[PDB]
Design an enzyme around this catalytic site. Structure first.
Site: not given
Ligand SMILES: Nc1nc2c(ncn2[C@@H]2O[C@H](COP(=O)(O)OP(=O)(O)OP(=O)(O)O)[C@@H](O)[C@H]2O)c(=O)[nH]1
Ligand SMILES: Nc1ncnc2c1ncn2[C@@H]1O[C@H](COP(=O)(O)OP(=O)(O)CP(=O)(O)O)[C@@H](O)[C@H]1O
Ligand SMILES: Nc1nc2c(ncn2[C@@H]2O[C@H](COP(=O)(O)OP(=O)(O)O)[C@@H](O)[C@H]2O)c(=O)[nH]1
Ligand SMILES: [Ca+2]
Ligand SMILES: [Ca+2]
Ligand SMILES: [Ca+2]
Ligand SMILES: [Mg+2]
Ligand SMILES: [Mg+2]
Ligand SMILES: [Mg+2]
Lengths: 54, 438, 352, 425
Positions: B10-11, B15, B144-145, B183, B228, B254
C-alpha cells in the site's frame, strides 16, 4: 543491579541488567474463503441484472 | 548470516519503505546506483549488511524488498526516483485500481487475483537466501490495500513459509492525516486475521508522529515525507541489530523471545529520543541519562498512552552513538527511583541494552539534526491497549448502525466477519487487562 | 464557546458546577457520549482515560486524576503508606494499620497479631477497628478473635487499624467528632485547601466502655441522623464550622485552630499528594486532570491530628456548595478555559 | 489514468454541461480549439481524467452530448467551446420530448438510447482504467429526466461495477417551465435512488434565491443560474482533476460519503459568493463561515433542520493549511449537534493549490445531510396536489404508462423521506 552477558565488538556492545528477579488455515481453506466471497459477489450481480432485465 | 525480506504493502507501506531504504543506504555507505565502495568482497559475502542487501557480479547491492500496491502511482515514484536503480522491475508490483479504502476489496475482490503473482515475486527473492529468517511487513491499518491485502498475504506466508518469523510495522490511523472514515473498520478487520500470523508488530500512531513533528521539529503542517523520514529513523533503530555486528536481537526470533512472552500480546511500544530540529541554531547535546529519561515521557512515544498505569513484560534499550554501559546503568538507576515502572510478577524486572557506536545517520537536507547519541526504547506495556480501546470504540459507534457495511458486503465479505473480528478484539483487550490490572 | 459532558448524574458537587458553567453563557453541555468536548465530568468507576486527548484541536480536561484511587481506597492507602519511603512505615500521623484479606480468598494477619499480642502483654490499650470500602459494616472490639472472625464472614478486603481511644471531646456533651477538609488539585498540580472545613460531630456522649453501640463512636452524618437521638442538639445537623470550632479552642484550650490542628492537616495533605505526584501528574500528558479530594482527620486529647481516609468523590456541606463549586470553576476550569478575591483556597506550596 | 466519461442530456443538461467544460477547460489551460497553453504542470497532471489526447497534442473532452431535439446542441456547437467537442459525440433526435418523462424514458428516448450507448462504449474502450460516469441533467423535463435515467439504467447494466455520478437539477415552482415538473422529478428520483452512487442535488430555487438575495441580480436568467452550477461542478471535481490524497477518485469518495446505499444525495455549496466590494480579500474564517451557511448552499435545504452524515470540504488557493484545519475543527466543535455522533471524524478537508479563475481562494462544500429530505418533501407535496385529481396524467397515459407506476414512484420517494428521518433522530 547485576550486569550479565556482556558482549563487545568493534561496532558496539550489549548486555543485560536485572533489577529484580521474577515472582493456521491451509492453502485449501484460504482458496475456499476467497472463492466463497467471489460466489457471493456473482450472486449479488446476477440479482442486479435479473432486476434490470425485468 | 541469514537474510531478511522486507515487504511494503500500500501507499503507507511503500512510502515508508522508500524512506527506510534511503536511510539504510546512507548508513551502510551504499550509493543510489547500488555501489558500495567499502564492500571489498565483490559480488558476494555473508556480512551483517548482507541480511538486507544482495550482491550482483557487477558489485550492485540490491535490497531484499518487494513493493506491492493495487494502484501504480505511488510505486511509479520509486521507479523514477533517486533510488530507481537500487531495485529491479521484478521487485515493484502494481495493479490498476486500488481497494478504495475497503478492506473487503483488498482482501477478497482484488487480493484474490494478484496474491499468486506477489508470492511468485517473493519466492524469487527467497531463492537467493541460503538461510531466510523471515519477513518485515510495512503497511497501514486504514487503507484497503494496507489492511485487506496484507492480511491475505500474511496468511499465505504462514502457509508457504511455516517456520519463518514475520514482523510488522503498522501505521495506526489518525484523523489529522486520515483519508477515510471507515479506517476503524479496516484496522480491526486486519488485526483480527493477521493476529495469529504476526510474531511481533510495532504500531506507529500517525497522531504521535504528527505531534512530534510539530512540537520538536516546528513543522506547522507536516507532510508524509516529514512523517516517513522520522518513522524510518525509529525503524532503522529497531533493525540495526540485524544489519550490524552485535549480540542482541541478532535474528528475527530474538525479537519475540525478548519482547513477547505471550503470543497475542505482541505489540511493543516504541519510544525515541532525541528528536531535534535541524533549523535550530545549535542544540545542547543531551546525555545518556537525559535521553534515557526521555524514553519515559509520553511525548516521544510512537503511540500516545500512559505506561505508568500498565505493567511491563519486557524492555529493550537500543542506543546509537557515544554510549558506554556505565552511563546506561547510572541513568537506569536514577530513573527507577523517580519513575513508575511496574513489571508483571511473572517477568524479571530488567533491561536488555544494545549499544551501537555509530550515531544516527541523518538524511542530507532532512528535518532532523545530527546528535552525538540517541536511543530507542522497546517496551511491551499493557498501556498500549489504550490504542485498541480507542479504535474499538469508534468501531462500535459506526457498526451499531451498520454504517458503511454495505460497501464490504458488496465485495463478497459476510457481515458476520465484522462481529467475529470485533469479538476477537474484545478478547484482546481482556487479555491486556488480566495481565496489567489487579 | 467551550463544551463539556456530564457522565456522573449522582454528583452533587459537579451538578452545581455544571449549573454554574451554563450560567456563564460561555459553556455548552453536550450529550454524555459526544467526544468533541473540552471538559469531562466523568463517571466514578471505570473512567475511560484512554480516550482523552486524542481529538484534534480540542484541549481536553477531566475532573479525576488517573491513579488517585491508590490514596482513596482503604487497603490502597495502607499499602501506599507502608511501602512509600516518603511516608515510611514509621509515619506518625497515620494510625497503625494492616491489610487483612478474608480467609476465603499480601496479607498482614500474622504481622497484626504480633503487634496485637505485644499490646495485650504490655497492659496498653488494645482497641482496634475493622472497616472496608464496600460498606455503607464496621466493627469495634478489643478482642482479636472478633475482628478477624468478622472479616471472614465477609468477602472483600478489609483493614484493621488502631482505634483512637483518647479522642478530643467537645464540651458540653463529651462527644467525638472528625474534620473534613476539601482539597483541590489543578492541572498544574497546585494543592489548594478550601478555607472552610466542617466538623461532623457526634450528638452522643463518648462512652469508652461499650463499643457495641456504635452511635457515639462513628461520626458519619447518616449514622447520627438515623441511630442517634440527640441529632442537631448542639449544632445544626451535627456540623460545626471553623468559626465556631476555632472560638471553642480559644475559650476552652487557649489555642487556635490554625496552630493546634490546621498545621498538621496542611502537612498531611501535602505529604500524601506530593508522594503520588510522579505517578498521577498530567504535566506532560496529552490530556489534563484536576480532582477534588475529601480528607477525614481525627484529633486526640493531645491535639494531635491523625489521618482516617481520603475521599476521591466527596460531597460538600449544604452551606458551602455555592462558594466551593464557584472556586472549582475559577482555579480548575477557567484556568484552562478562560472566560471573556481574596482566594477561598490556601495554596500549599511544594517542590515538583 | 483513471478516466471519467461525461454525459449531458437535454436542454438543462447540455447548457450546464457546456459551461462546466468551459470552466475546467480554462483551469487546465485548454483553449477552445483543444490546444494547451498553460504555464503549470499541475494542469496536465490529471488532464486525462476528463480529456482524451488526440494527434498534435490536442485534448478532446471525454463528453457525450445527448438530446431529443437539435436546438440546444446546435447552440453548444456554435457556442464558445463548441469546437472542442468530438463531432461524433453529438447524438440527437428531432422529435423532442415535450417535457414528458414518458417520452424520454419509454417512447422517443428508447429509439435513440442504443446509439448513445454505442458512443459511451467507444469512449470506454479507449480508457486505460475507467473510473465511472458523470451525468448532467434536469429532472423537471423530458429528455434529461426521462432519457437521462434511461441511460443510467442501461449504463449500469453494461458497467455494473463502475461508479455512476450525476449533477441533477431539481425543479422549483419559482423557476418552472411546465406544471408537470413534479411528475417528471418524482419518476426520476426513483431511478436515481436505485442506480446512482452519488447525486448532487441542485435546486433551481436555491440558485434563484442566491442570484437574487445574495448576488443582487434583479432579474435572474438561466444563464445566471448556470454560472453557479459551473462554479460548483468545478469545485466538487477538483479532487479528481488535480493532485490529492482525499476523495482522489469516485469510488473512494463514495466510500467516505455514502454510509447507506440509498442515502447518496448531496447538498453542494460554494464560497465566496460576492455581488459586484468584489476585490476584497477573503480570510479563511470567512470562507469557512460562508461555506457552511445555508445561503451558500444550492439544495435550498436548511442544514440546521437535520444532521450531517458526512462532509467533504475542498479549499482552493495558496493559503495556510494550518489555519484551514483550525477553522474546520472550529465549525465542528462549535456546532457538533448538527453532526451525527455515530460516525467519528465524518468531516474531511482537502486542499488544492490552484484557485479558480479570478479568485485568490475559494471553498467547495459537499454535504450528505438528512436535511435533504425537505427537498423530496416539497416535490412529494407538489406531486400529490395534482395526482390526487389525476391532473395532467393524460400526457403520460398517452405514452403507455399506467397510474400504478405513479403511485409506486410516490411511495418510493416517501420511503426515502422516512429513511432520512430515522437517521436524523
Ligand atoms: N505515516 C504515514 N502514513 C500514511 C502514509 N500514506 C498513507 N498513510 C496513512 O494510511 C492510511 C490510508 O491508507 P493507505 O496506505 O494510503 O491506503 P492503501 O494501503 O494504499 O490502500 P488503498 O485503499 O487501495 O489505497 C491513512 O490513515 C494515512 O494517514 C505515509 O506515507 N506515511
Ligand atoms: N482508627 C480510628 N480511630 C477512631 N475513630 C475512627 C477510626 N477509624 C474510623 N473512625 C471513625 O469512623 C468514622 C470514619 O469512618 P470511615 O471514613 O473509615 O468510613 P467511611 O469512609 O464509610 C465514612 P466517610 O468516607 O464519609 O468519611 C469517623 O467519624 C471516626 O470517628
Ligand atoms: N439551472 C438551469 N435549469 C434549467 C435550465 N434549463 C431548464 N432548466 C430547468 O429544467 C427543467 C426543464 O427541463 P429541460 O432540461 O428544459 O427539459 P429537457 O430538455 O427535456 O431535458 C425545468 O425545471 C427548468 O427550470 C438551465 O439552463 N439552467
Ligand atoms: Ca560483499
Ligand atoms: Ca506462523
Ligand atoms: Ca419515431
Ligand atoms: Mg492506495
Ligand atoms: Mg469513604
Ligand atoms: Mg426546456
Amino acid at each position: 543491579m547485576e550486569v550479565i552477558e556482556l558482549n563487545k565488538c568493534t561496532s558496539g556492545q550489549s548486555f543485560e541488567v536485572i533489577l529484580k528477579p521474577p515472582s493456521d488455515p491451509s492453502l485449501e481453506e484460504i482458496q475456499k474463503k476467497l472463492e466463497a466471497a467471489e460466489e457471493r459477489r456473482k450472486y449479488q450481480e446476477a440479482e442486479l441484472l435479473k432486476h434490470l432485465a425485468e | 548470516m541469514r537474510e531478511c525480506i522486507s515487504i511494503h504493502v500500500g501507499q503507507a507501506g511503500v512510502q515508508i519503505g522508500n524512506a527506510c531504504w534511503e536511510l539504510y543506504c546512507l548508513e551502510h555507505g551504499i550509493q543510489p546506483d547500488g555501489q558500495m565502495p567499502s564492500d571489498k568482497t565483490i559480488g558476494g559475502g555473508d556480512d551483517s549488511f548482507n541480511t538486507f542487501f544482495s550482491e550482483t557480479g557487477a558489485g550492485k547491492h540490491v535490497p531484499r524488498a518487494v513493493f506491492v500496491d493495487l494502484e501504480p502511482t505511488v510505486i511509479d515514484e520509486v521507479r523514477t526516483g533517486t533510488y530507481r536503480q537500487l531495485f529491479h522491475p521484478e521487485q515493484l508490483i502494481t495493479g490498476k485500481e486500488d481497494a478504495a479504502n475497503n478492506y473487503a476489496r483488498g482482501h477478497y475482490t482484488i487480493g484474490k487475483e494478484i496474491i499468486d503473482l506477489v508470492l511468485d515475486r517473493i519466492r524469487k527473492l527467497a531463492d537467493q537466501c541460503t538461510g531466510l529468517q523471515g519477513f518485515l511487513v510495512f503497511h497501514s491499518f486504514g487503507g484497503g490495500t494496507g489492511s485487506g491485502f496484507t492480511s491475505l498475504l500474511m496468511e499465505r506466508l504462514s502457509v508457504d513459509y511455516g517456520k519463518k518469523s514475520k514482523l510488522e510495522f503498522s501505521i495506526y490511523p489518525a484523523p489529522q492525516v486520515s483519508t477515510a472514515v471507515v479506517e476503524p473498520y479496516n484496522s480491526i478487520l486486519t488485526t483480527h486475521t493477521t493476529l495469529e500470523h504476526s510474531d511481533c508488530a510495532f504500531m506507529v500512531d500517525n497522531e504521535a508522529i504528527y505531534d512530534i513533528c510539530r512540537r520538536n521539529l516546528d513543522i506547522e503542517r507536516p507532510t508524509y515525507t516529514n512523517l516517513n523520514r522520522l518513522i524510518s529513523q525509529i525503524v532503522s533503530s529497531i533493525t540495526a541489530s540485524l544489519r550490524f555486528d552485535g549480540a542482541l536481537n541478532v535474528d528475527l526470533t530474538e525479537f519475540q523471545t525478548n519482547l513477547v512472552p505471550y503470543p497475542r500480546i505482541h505489540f511493543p511500544l516504541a519510544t525515541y529520543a532525541p528528536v531535534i530540529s535541524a533549523e535550530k541554531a545549535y542544540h545542547e547535546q543531551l546525555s545518556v541519562a537525559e535521553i534515557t529519561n526521555a524514553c519515559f515521557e509520553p511525548a516521544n512515544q510512537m503511540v500516545k498512552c500512559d505506561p505508568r498505569h500498565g505493567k511491563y513484560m519486557a524492555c529493550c534499550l537500543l542506543y546509537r552513538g557515544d554510549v558506554v554501559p556505565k552511563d546506561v546503568n547510572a541513568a537506569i538507576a536514577t530513573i527507577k527511583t523517580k519513575r513508575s515502572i511496574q513489571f508483571v510478577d511473572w517477568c524479571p524486572t530488567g533491561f536488555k541494552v544494545g549499544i551501537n557506536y555509530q550515531p544516527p545517520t541523518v538524511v542530507p537536507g532532512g528535518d532532523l539534526a545530527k546528535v552525538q547519541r540517541a536511543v530507542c526504547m522497546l517496551s511491551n506495556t499493557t498501556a498500549i491497549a489504550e490504542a485498541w480501546a480507542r479504535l474499538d470504540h469508534k468501531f462500535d459507534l459506526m457498526y451499531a448502525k451498520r454504517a458503511f457495511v454495505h460497501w464490504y458486503v458488496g465485495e463478497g465479505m459476510e457481515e458476520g466477519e465484522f462481529s467475529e473480528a470485533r469479538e476477537d478484539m474484545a478478547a484482546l483487550e481482556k487479555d491486556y487487562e488480566e495481565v496489567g490490572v489487579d | 464557546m467551550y463544551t463539556f459532558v456530564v457522565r456522573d448524574e449522582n454528583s452533587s458537587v459537579y451538578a452545581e458546577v455544571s449549573r454554574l458553567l451554563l450560567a456563564t453563557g460561555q459553556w455548552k453541555r453536550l450529550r454524555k457520549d459526544n467526544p468533541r468536548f473540552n471538559l469531562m465530568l466523568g463517571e466514578r468507576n471505570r473512567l475511560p482515560f484512554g480516550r482523552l486527548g486524542h481529538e484534534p484541536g480540542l484541549v481536553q480536561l477531566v475532573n479525576y486524576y488517573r491513579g488517585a484511587d491508590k490514596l482513596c481506597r482503604k487497603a490502597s492507602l495502607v499499602k501506599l503508606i507502608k511501602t512509600s519511603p516518603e511516608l515510611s512505615e514509621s509515619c506518625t500521623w497515620f494510625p497503625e494499620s494492616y491489610v487483612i484479606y478474608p480467609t476465603n480468598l499480601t496479607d498482614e494477619r500474622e504481622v497484626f497479631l504480633a503487634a496485637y499480642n505485644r499490646r495485650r502483654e504490655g497492659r496498653e490499650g488494645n482497641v482496634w477497628i475493622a472497616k472496608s470500602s464496600a460498606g455503607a459494616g464496621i466493627l469495634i472490639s478489643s478482642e482479636a478473635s472478633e475482628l478477624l472472625d468478622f472479616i471472614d464472614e465477609q468477602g472483600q478486603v478489609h483493614v484493621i487499624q488502631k482505634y483512637l481511644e483518647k479522642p478530643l471531646l467537645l464540651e458540653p456533651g463529651h462527644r467525638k467528632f472528625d474534620i473534613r477538609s476539601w482539597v483541590l488539585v489543578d492541572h498544574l498540580y497546585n494543592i489548594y485547601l478550601y478555607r472552610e472545613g466542617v466538623l461532623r460531630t457526634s450528638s452522643e456522649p463518648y462512652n469508652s466502655a461499650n463499643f457495641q453501640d456504635k452511635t457515639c463512636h462513628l461520626t458519619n452524618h447518616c449514622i447520627q441522623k438515623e441511630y442517634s437521638k440527640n441529632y442537631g442538639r448542639y449544632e445544626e445537623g451535627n456540623e460545626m464550622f471553623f468559626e465556631e470550632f476555632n472560638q471553642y479552642l480559644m475559650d476552652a484550650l487557649n489555642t487556635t485552630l490554625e496552630n493546634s490542628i490546621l498545621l498538621q492537616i496542611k502537612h498531611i495533605i501535602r505529604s500524601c499528594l506530593m508522594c503520588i505526584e510522579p505517578a498521577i501528574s498530567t504535566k506532560h500528558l496529552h490530556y489534563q486532570s484536576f480532582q477534588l479530594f475529601g480528607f477525614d482527620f481525627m484529633v486526640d486529647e493531645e491535639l494531635k491530628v491523625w489521618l482516617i481516609e481520603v475521599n476521591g468523590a466527596p460531597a460538600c456541606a449544604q452551606k458551602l456548595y455555592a462558594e466551593l463549586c464557584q472556586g472549582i470553576v475559577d482555579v480548575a476550569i477557567s484556568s484552562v478555559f478562560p472566560l471573556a478575591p481574596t482566594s477561598i483556597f490556601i495554596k500549599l506550596h511544594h517542590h515538583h | 489514468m483513471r478516466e471519467i466519461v461525461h454525459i449531458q442530456a437535454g436542454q438543462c443538461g447540455n447548457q450546464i454541461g457546456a459551461k462546466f467544460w468551459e470552466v475546467i477547460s480554462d483551469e487546465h489551460g485548454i483553449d477552445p480549439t483543444g490546444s494547451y497553453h498553460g504555464d503549470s504542470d499541475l494542469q496536465l497532471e490529471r488532464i486525462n481524467v476528463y480529456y482524451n489526447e488526440a494527434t498534435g497534442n490536442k485534448y478532446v473532452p471525454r463528453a457525450i452530448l445527448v438530446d431529443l431535439e437539435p436546438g440546444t446542441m446546435d447552440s453548444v456547437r456554435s457556442g464558445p467551446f463548441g469546437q472542442i467537442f468530438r463531432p461524433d459525440n453529438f447524438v440527437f433526435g428531432q422529435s423532442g420530448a415535450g417535457n414528458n418523462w414518458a417520452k424520454g424514458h419509454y417512447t422517443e428516448g428508447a429509439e435513440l438510447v442504443d446509439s448513445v450507448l454505442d458512443v459511451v462504449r467507444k469512449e470506454s474502450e479507449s480508457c486505460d482504467c475507467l473510473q465511472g460516469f458523470q451525468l448532467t441533467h434536469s429532472l423537471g423535463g423530458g429528455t434529461g429526466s426521462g432519457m437521462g435515467t434511461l441511460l443510467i439504467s442501461k449504463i449500469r447494466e453494461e458497467y455494473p461495477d463502475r461508479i455512476m455520478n450525476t449533477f441533477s437539477v431539481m425543479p422549483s415552482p419559482k423557476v418552472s417551465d411546465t406544471v408537470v415538473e413534479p411528475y417528471n422529478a418524482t419518476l426520476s428520483v426513483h431511478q436515481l435512488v436505485e442506480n446512482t452512487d452519488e447525486t448532487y442535488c441542485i435546486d433551481n430555487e436555491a440558485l434563484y434565491d442566491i442570484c437574487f438575495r445574495t448576488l443582487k441580480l434583479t432579474t435572474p436568467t438561466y444563464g445566471d443560474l448556470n454560472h453557479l452550477v459551473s462554479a460548483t461542478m468545478s469545485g466538487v471535481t477538483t479532487c479528481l482533476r488535480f493532485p490529492g490524497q482525499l476523495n482522489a477518485d469516485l469510488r473512494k469518495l463514495a466510500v467516505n460519503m455514502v454510509p447507506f446505499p440509498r442515502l447518496h444525495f448531496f447538498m453542494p455549496g460554494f464560497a465566496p459568493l460576492t455581488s459586484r466590494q468584489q476585490y476584497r480579500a477573503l480570510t479563511v474564517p470567512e470562507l469557512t463561515q460562508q461555506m457552511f451557511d445555508s445561503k451558500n448552499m444550492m439544495a435550498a435545504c436548511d442544514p440546521r433542520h437535520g444532521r450531517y452524515l458526512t462532509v467533504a470540504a475542498i479549499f482552493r488557493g495558496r493559503m495556510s493549511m494550518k489555519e484551514v484545519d483550525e477553522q474546520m475543527l472550529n465549525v465542528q466543535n462549535k456546532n457538533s449537534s448538527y453532526f451525527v455522533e455515530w460516525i467519528p471524524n465524518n468531516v474531511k478537508t482537502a486542499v488544492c493549490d490552484i484557485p479558480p479563475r479570478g479568485l485568490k481562494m475559494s471553498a467547495t462544500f459537499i454535504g450528505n445531510s438528512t436535511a435533504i429530505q425537505e427537498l423530496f418533501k416539497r416535490i412529494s407535496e407538489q406531486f400529490t396536489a395534482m395526482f390526487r385529481r389525476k391532473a395532467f396524467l393524460h400526457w403520460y397515459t398517452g405514452e403507455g404508462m399506467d397510474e400504478m407506476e405513479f403511485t409506486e414512484a410516490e411511495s418510493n420517494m416517501n420511503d426515502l423521506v422516512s429513511e432520512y428521518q430515522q437517521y436524523q433522530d
